[PDB]
Each structure stands twice: as structure tokens, then as C-alpha cells.
RNA sequence: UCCCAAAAUGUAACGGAGGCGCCCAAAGGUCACCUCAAGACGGUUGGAAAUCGUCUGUAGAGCGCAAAGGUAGAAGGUGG
RNA sequence: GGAUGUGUCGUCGCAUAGACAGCCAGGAGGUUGGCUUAGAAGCAGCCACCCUUCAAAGAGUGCGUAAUAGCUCACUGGUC
């Protein structure tokens, strides 16, 4: 969710994935296919939903942590400088990236644990399976 | 896998379903360019622990091994491949996947067993006889049973490159 | 009748029809009677 | 069956953790009298039919079953 | 002094961070010499670190203050 | 985001030794499976999901009650 301590601010830019593996920590995983900002509350909205579906196992890996502070409008003005260090924290995701990947539970019993998680995401994803063997 | 071409220029393939790999050892690192589909259907099985027929256009069957494959992001599709020609008595080192069999005594119990490390690497495989898999006992494993390299029975010869006390699978607790 | 934007099956009956330009849903059960338009 | 079984092991209820905490165990001998009553309800081909049929019943009530074959 | 500044320089904003208006008869000139942080094992008030000792040790320390570059064949640490 | 709207490439698949959809008939015995409950008997929720017969019929699809019950499915044969 929210980081523990840091610097305080940032900026904005994009270009395709870079460190989003594939299989690892599980057999089934969910992959993001579009450039976006993933709100930390948009992850909970995913995890939590996923939990419910899984009556146990917790074999859910969320490997897209919010390494980013965004700001906002103190109400209107414009005559002041940097604003709202605290609007919210997001975690820039890029295509091919892997935010989710369950483990242990049946295909179907997974093709749903994701589907749902998809429904609260600002981007389109697609489920991936195996044959992932680069580095280890 | 009848790969025929092998030039720096791939216009004649990029449009036409054809992957593009390279092979070697220390002698010949013949430029290459095999067929999409084929490799695609191929590597699935033999994976990286499977040497296959490489008769390049002209007919010169060669023995190699799937070393490293780098596929496209966004599109699960593969783009490049490295074939490290087989050997005879020694290749280098190989990547062999860990597998389970028989219900574990932790599953029905109250928790689920987890495989801390999917594919495992052992020192010195042994060209001609390199484990195209690795089934492992899990049953015994209860509520916190971690198995390691110092456990897994190896195929007469093969030595474990992975540090021993390293957990390959444990049976994770419930919830 | 149900005019939803995201129409889809609801039980082993829903016969998703496509009448005049519209995507419809006809199931033995009526509360299943769907329709995008 | 469940009733007679309870009585026999002495079991008390049933179980919801028949995988964690089960309840007990008995011998085939008992299983004899059982079939020798449930018979008019045991469409069994010959014994074993009902000799093993009853296993599962005892096998999902949390009842560990004695002996059987071999050794 | 950093970042923004788009690998020369330069480059704005009520853009993002932080210091100065000193200090040192020596914290200087020169000439000699020593070399750090830290962990581990073992040791007295000690017992967390700290003192002594023994291994490891690009220095992960130090440089009067803010940061950056720089620096141990010393700009680091003593004495004439 | 939704969809038997078309076009073209790929994957399983399952199959004249006669499938799919349709049709007549069947449908199991233990068991109201154990557990939990004011009770819940293939269908509110824990645990499993074995036995027997058979050509067959899975402790089980969904609908239904306060549970019943009742209605069909998966598995079975003929007719094409």
C-alpha cells in the first residue's frame, strides 16, 4: 500500500514493461496490458476481492507496490507552489507487467479470482500460465 | 526443426511466421532463423533439457539445447532463441524443474504445500542423459515441512548445483 | 424487462437473441428477460 | 448405521474436522452384525458388496477401520 | 549545492530539497610519520554501542559547517 | 463493458468400429453421506466425495419448501 518513508514527490513519463517477469511465486498470474497508474486503493480493491473468493491459501502475490506520491488541488487558487503531498500513492504499471498470480487453486477457481480483480482495474489485463524460464 | 536461413536481415521472416534463434558451443556459432510455428510447438515439450534435430537447409543435422529464450512483452509471443549445441560427455549446467507426486500429509490435514523453487539447477547434467524432469516426494510433509536439495533423490550421477539447505518445497499453513 | 448495458447469460436457458439490431435475452424465467436496448 | 456405529465406538456426535480431529475405530466383526440387519436394505451382491459398501459410511463419519488384507 | 537542464556550456516557474552573512594561530607554511567505518570470536567496573586484543576490511570512514565532485601512494590522523 | 453479426488465421476436443442437437424410456441401492443446526435429506455453511450392482446411473447441475417432496442434468439403449 503506502510506502514507509522516502523523499516526498515526483513527475510523470512512460514506455513498455521492463521488470515484470511472468511465472514466479505461483502457476497462475494476471498481467496488465496498458500504461496506467495503479492506485494503492485499487490494489486492495483487488486483493480483498481475491481473498473472499479464496476460502484459504493466500497464495495470492501482489507484486506491484506503490512507489509513487501524487498531489492535488488544495481547493482551487493556483498562487502557491507544490501542493497536497498526500492525495494518494500509485504504482506505475506498464504492459506485459505482472501484478497478480495466484497459486494452488484450480484453473477455473483462478479464472475468476482474476476476472473479478480485473473489474476494478483502470486497465485491461489477461491471464497467463507457464513456460516462463528466463532467470532464477 | 528444419531451420534454413541464417542472415542478419530478417525481413524475409519477420512478416512470415518464423522465429529467429542462434546456436553454438565454441566452434561454430552459425547465424540462424528457424520457423515460428514449429519451435513454438516444439520447445513446449522438450523445454530446456531437450536436444532436438537441427538439419539446416542443405542437410547437416546438429545437436543443441535450449539455452535462453527472450520473448516479446505485451504479446506472450517469443522473438529470439539461443541453442547451445549439445556435447557428448559434458554440456555445462542445466535447468531442471521440481515436481510433486502423491497427496501430501499437509494437504488434507489443514494447509497447502508450496513449491519454494519451481525449476531447480544442479551442477553438471551429463549430455545424453539429462533429466527431462524431476518428481519429488511431498506426502510426509505436514504443517511446516520444508524439503531441500539435500533431499531430492538425483538420477544416478547428476550433482546438485543449488545450495543444499535451500528449500524447494514446504507445505504452507492454512489461511 | 431489463435494459442493462452488460447483457449476459444467467442460467442454462438464456437464449441470447439478436433481433432487429438489438442484442436480447430470452430465458424460460422472465426476470432473466434481458436487453441492451 | 451412523447410530449403531456411535453406540459401538461410543461415539457421541459426528465430526466437522474428520480430517483434523476424527473420532475412533472398530473391527470388521461389528460390521458383520450390521450387514446382518441392514441386509433388507443392502442391495448387495454377495457380502463384500456390503462388507466394503459400509466402509465409506464409516469412512466419512470419522471412523478409522481395522485390518483388511495382506501381511 | 543538488534535481528540474532534454549526457558541452547555458536555460524559467509563488517547481522539488538544503545550507551561508562564519570559523581556524593555527583547522595555516613546511618537514617527518600513522591510517579508516564496521562485523566476528575472546576478554574487567563493563555487558547495547563503547576500552583492550586478534582475523576480515577500497575505505562501506574521515574531511570545522549545506550538498556535490574529490581524496588512503591523502585533501584523512599526530609531532618539529 | 456486452453479444451464435460477418471476413481470415491458430488450440484443443470429441467422436460411421455411427457422436451433437432433437426424440421414447431410465436413473440407481447405502444415505435425510458425517458434520451444523429450531430443522436443511445431490442444491444456506464445515469435511469428504468411498462402497455395491450395472449397460447404466456422480454422496452431485439449477429451480423449488420451513426441511419434504416434485421437476431435469451428468452416465445408459434404440431411431436417424
Curated annotation (Swiss-Prot), chain A:
Which Gene Ontology biological process is one annotated for this entry?
translation
Q: Which lineage do the record's taxonomy fields give for this organism?
A: Bacteria, Thermotogati, Deinococcota, Deinococci, Deinococcales
Family annotation (InterPro entries):
Ribosomal_uL16, Ribosomal_uL16_bact-type, Ribosomal_uL16_CS, Ribosomal_uL16_dom, Ribosomal_uL16_sf
Top-level taxon of origin: Bacteria
Q: List UniProt keywords, sorted A-Z.
A: Ribonucleoprotein, Ribosomal protein, RNA-binding, rRNA-binding, tRNA-binding
What NCBIfam families would the database entry show?
A: rplP_bact (TIGR01164)
Task: Give an example GO cellular component term for this record.
Answer: cytosolic large ribosomal subunit
Name its species: Deinococcus radiodurans (strain ATCC 13939 / DSM 20539 / JCM 16871 / CCUG 27074 / LMG 4051 / NBRC 15346 / NCIMB 9279 / VKM B-1422 / R1)
The text of the family note is:
Belongs to the universal ribosomal protein uL16 family.
Q: What is this protein called?
A: Large ribosomal subunit protein uL16
The function of this protein is: Binds the 5S and 23S rRNAs and is also seen to make contacts with the A and P site tRNAs. Interacts with A site tRNA mimics, and is probably one of the key factors, along with a helix of the 23S rRNA, in positioning tRNA stems in the peptidyl-transferase center.
GO molecular-function annotation terms? rRNA binding; structural constituent of ribosome; tRNA binding
Give the multimer and partner information.
Answer: Part of the 50S ribosomal subunit. Contacts the CTC protein (RL25).
Report if keyword tRNA-binding is assigned: yes
From Swiss-Prot, chain B:
| Region (N-terminal domain) location | 1-104
Respond yes or no to whether keyword Transmembrane helix is given for this record.
no
- GO CC, any one term: cytosolic large ribosomal subunit
The UniProt keyword set, sorted, is: Ribonucleoprotein, Ribosomal protein, RNA-binding, rRNA-binding, tRNA-binding
GO process terms (BP): translation
Q: Where is this region: Middle domain?
A: 105-175
A GO molecular function term, named singly, is:
structural constituent of ribosome
Q: Does the keyword Transport apply?
A: no
* Subunit composition and interactions: Part of the 50S ribosomal subunit. Contacts proteins L11 and L16, the A site tRNA, and the 5S and 23S rRNAs.
Q: State the family it belongs to.
A: Belongs to the bacterial ribosomal protein bL25 family. CTC subfamily.
**Function as written in the Swiss-Prot or TrEMBL entry:** This is one of 3 proteins that mediate the attachment of the 5S rRNA onto the large ribosomal subunit. This protein has three domains. The N-terminal one is bound on the solvent face, the middle domain fills the space between the 5S rRNA and the L11 arm contacting the 23S rRNA while the C-terminal domain is on the edge of the intersubunit interface and contacts the A site. The protein conformation changes upon binding of a tRNA mimic to the A site, although the mimic does not interact directly with CTC itself, consistent with CTCs presumed role in moderating A site binding.
Recorded protein name is Large ribosomal subunit protein bL25
Q: Please name the source species.
A: Deinococcus radiodurans (strain ATCC 13939 / DSM 20539 / JCM 16871 / CCUG 27074 / LMG 4051 / NBRC 15346 / NCIMB 9279 / VKM B-1422 / R1)
What is the primary gene name for this protein?
A: rplY
Parent-record interval covered: 1 to 175 of 237
From Swiss-Prot, chain C:
Q: Does the keyword Ribosomal protein apply?
A: yes
Keyword annotations: Metal-binding, Ribonucleoprotein, Ribosomal protein, RNA-binding, rRNA-binding, Zinc
Q: How many and how are cofactors bound here?
A: Binds 1 zinc ion per subunit.
For biological process, the GO terms are:
translation
| Gene Ontology MF term list | metal ion binding; rRNA binding; structural constituent of ribosome
- Ribonucleoprotein listed as a keyword: yes
Per the record, the domain of life is Bacteria
- SUPFAM superfamilies named among the record's database cross-references: Ribosomal protein L36 (SSF57840)
Q: Where does Zn(2+) bind?
A: 11, 14, 27, 32
Spell out the InterPro entries in the cross-references: Ribosomal_bL36, Ribosomal_bL36_sp
Q: Which Pfam families match?
A: Ribosomal_L36
Q: Which cofactor does it need?
A: Zn(2+)
Q: Which cellular components does GO assign to this protein?
A: cytoplasm; ribonucleoprotein complex; ribosome
Q: Which HAMAP family match?
A: Ribosomal_bL36
Q: Which family does it belong to?
A: Belongs to the bacterial ribosomal protein bL36 family.
Q: Which PANTHER family match?
A: 50S RIBOSOMAL PROTEIN L36, CHLOROPLASTIC (PTHR42888), LARGE RIBOSOMAL SUBUNIT PROTEIN BL36C (PTHR42888:SF1)
Q: What does the UniProt record say this protein does?
A: Binds the 23S rRNA.
**Self-association state and partner proteins as the record states:** Part of the 50S ribosomal subunit.
State the protein's name. Large ribosomal subunit protein bL36
The organism encoding this protein is Deinococcus radiodurans (strain ATCC 13939 / DSM 20539 / JCM 16871 / CCUG 27074 / LMG 4051 / NBRC 15346 / NCIMB 9279 / VKM B-1422 / R1)
Swiss-Prot record, chain D:
Name the source's superkingdom. Answer: Bacteria
Q: Which modifications occur after translation, per UniProt? A: One or more lysine residues are methylated.
Give the transmembrane region(s): none
* Recorded family membership: Belongs to the universal ribosomal protein uL11 family.
The subunit field of the Swiss-Prot or TrEMBL record says: Part of the ribosomal stalk of the 50S ribosomal subunit. Interacts with L10 and the large rRNA to form the base of the stalk. L10 forms an elongated spine to which L12 dimers bind in a sequential fashion forming a multimeric L10(L12)X complex. Contacts the CTC protein (RL25).
What this protein is reported to do is described as: Forms part of the ribosomal stalk which helps the ribosome interact with GTP-bound translation factors.
Q: Under which name does UniProt file this protein?
A: Large ribosomal subunit protein uL11
Which source organism?
Deinococcus radiodurans (strain ATCC 13939 / DSM 20539 / JCM 16871 / CCUG 27074 / LMG 4051 / NBRC 15346 / NCIMB 9279 / VKM B-1422 / R1)
From the broadest rank down, the organism's phylogenetic lineage runs:
Bacteria, Thermotogati, Deinococcota, Deinococci, Deinococcales
Gene name as annotated: rplK
Task: State start and end of the fragment within the whole protein.
Answer: 74 to 144 of 144
Amino acid at each position: 500500500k503506502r510506502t514507509k518513508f522516502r523523499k516526498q514527490f515526483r513527475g510523470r513519463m512512460t514506455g513498455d514493461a521492463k521488470g515484470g517477469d511472468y511465472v514466479a511465486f505461483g502457476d497462475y498470474g494476471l498481467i496488465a496490458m496498458e500504461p496506467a497508474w495503479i492506485k494503492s486503493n485499487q490494489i486492495e480493491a483487488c486483493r480483498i476481492v481475491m481473498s473472499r473468493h479464496f476460502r484459504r491459501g493466500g497464495k495470492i502475490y501482489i507484486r506491484i507496490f506503490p512507489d509513487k506520491p501524487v498531489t492535488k488541488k488544495p481547493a482551487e487558487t493556483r498562487m502557491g507552489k507544490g501542493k497536497g503531498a498526500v492525495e494518494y500513492w500509485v504504482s506505475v504499471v506498464k504492459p506485459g507487467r505482472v501484478m497478480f498470480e495466484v497459486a494452488g487453486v484450480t484453473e477455473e477457481q483462478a479464472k475468476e479470482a482474476f476476472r473479478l480483480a480485473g473489474h476494478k482495474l483502470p486497465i485491461q489485463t489477461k491471464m497467463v500460465k507457464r513456460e516462463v524460464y528466463d532467470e532464477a | 526443426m528444419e531451420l534454413t536461413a541464417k542472415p542478419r536481415t530478417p525481413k524475409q521472416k519477420l512478416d512470415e511466421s518464423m522465429i529467429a534463434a542462434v546456436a553454438y558451443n565454441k566452434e561454430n556459432n552459425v547465424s540462424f532463423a528457424l520457423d515460428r510455428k514449429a519451435f513454438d510447438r516444439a520447445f513446449r515439450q522438450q523445454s530446456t533439457t531437450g536436444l532436438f534435430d537441427i538439419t539446416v537447409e542443405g542437410g547437416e543435422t546438429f545437436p543443441a539445447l535450449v539455452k535462453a529464450v527472450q520473448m516479446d512483452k505485451r504479446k506472450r509471443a517469443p522473438i529470439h532463441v539461443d541453442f547451445y549445441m549439445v556435447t557428448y560427455g559434458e554440456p555445462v549446467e542445466v535447468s531442471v524443474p521440481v515436481h510433486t507426486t502423491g497427496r501430501s500429509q499437509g494437504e488434507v490435514q489443514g494447509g497447502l504445500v508450496d513449491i519454494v523453487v519451481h525449476n531447480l539447477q544442479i551442477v553438471a547434467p551429463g549430455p545424453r542423459r539429462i533429466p527431462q524432469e524431476l518428481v519429488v516426494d511431498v506426502t510426509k510433509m505436514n504443517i511446516g515441512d520444508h524439503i531441500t536439495a539435500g533431499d531430492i533423490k538425483l538420477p544416478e550421477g547428476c550433482t546438485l548445483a543449488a545450495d543444499p539447505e535451500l528449500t524447494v518445497v514446504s507445505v504452507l499453513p492454512p489461511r | 424487462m431489463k435494459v442493462r448495458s452488460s447483457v449476459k447469460k444467467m442460467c442454462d436457458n438464456c437464449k441470447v437473441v439478436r433481433r432487429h439490431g438489438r442484442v436480447l435475452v430470452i430465458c424460460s424465467n422472465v426476470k432473466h428477460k434481458q436487453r441492451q436496448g | 448405521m451412523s447410530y449403531l456405529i456411535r453406540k459401538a465406538a461410543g461415539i457421541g456426535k459426528g465430526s466437522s474436522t474428520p480430517n483434523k480431529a476424527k473420532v475412533g475405530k472398530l473391527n470388521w466383526d461389528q460390521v458383520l452384525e450390521i450387514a446382518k440387519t441392514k441386509m433388507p436394505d443392502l442391495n448387495a451382491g454377495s457380502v463384500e458388496a456390503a462388507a466394503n459398501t459400509v466402509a465409506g459410511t464409516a469412512r466419512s463419519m470419522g471412523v478409522t477401520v481395522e485390518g483388511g488384507p495382506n501381511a
